[PDB]
Design a protein around this ligand. Structure first.
Ligand SMILES: Nc1ncnc2c1ncn2[C@@H]1O[C@H](COP(=O)(O)OP(=O)(O)OC[C@H]2O[C@@H](O)[C@H](O)[C@@H]2O)[C@@H](O)[C@H]1O
Length: 166
């Protein structure tokens, strides 16, 4: 009910403000998949992500951080920390699903009021940003999308998501 599916590339530019949500490891590696593409296009955001990983490490599991893209004042990046390591070393799919839930709940709480890096680089009220994501967890982390979907649909009534399908 709160999910809208779009087929297309989430990184094609849009004219409206949005938060790009994606699933992250705590090892400072935007190393593959969508994270690699964000690293190529938003290197200052990658720097912030790496600094947060250096400061907190796997203590970040279940949290999210909102980062400026810096290249586009219409785009913020929301990192959901759902696994200690990336690539083949990722956590158990049950763990990733539960940290996704916990991280999205912190984002929900923030919008209703994570934002330390936004100070000075957020253009609009946080509620004005659309929440968009690829099919997170379903690639390098291997979690069947339908399981993450149930996590997304639990936030029905508080948050609406646009999910890009390639
Ligand atoms: N521009 C893109 N646009 C839309 N969808 C995309 C795009 N790039 C990838 N996708 C799709 O997004 C889904 C998830 O992408 P992954 O990168 O594999 O993310 P995830 O499964 O959640 O694993 C996260 C892990 O990999 C890295 O992204 C990250 O560093 C983390 O360690 C896959 O179906 C993938 O094909």
């Amino acid at each position: 009910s709160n999910i809208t599916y779009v087929k297309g590339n989430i990184l094609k530019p849009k004219s409206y403000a949005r938060i790009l949500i994606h699933s992250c490891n705590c090892n400072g590696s935007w190393g593959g998949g969508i994270a690699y593409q964000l690293a190529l296009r938003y290197p200052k955001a990658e720097k912030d992500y790496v600094e947060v990983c250096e400061k907190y490490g796997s203590n970040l599991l279940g949290k999210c951080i909102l980062l400026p893209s810096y290249e586009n004042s219409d785009l913020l990046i929301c990192c959901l920390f759902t696994s200690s390591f990336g690539g083949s070393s990722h956590g158990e799919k049950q763990s990733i699903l539960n940290y996704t839930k916990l991280a999205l709940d912190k984002l929900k709480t923030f919008r209703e009021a994570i934002g330390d890096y936004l100070n000075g680089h957020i253009k609009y009220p946080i509620g004005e940003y659309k929440l968009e994501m690829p099919q997170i967890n379903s690639g390098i982390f291997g979690v069947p999308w339908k399981e993450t979907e149930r996590v997304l649909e639990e936030f029905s009534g508080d948050m609406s998501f646009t999910v890009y399908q390639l």
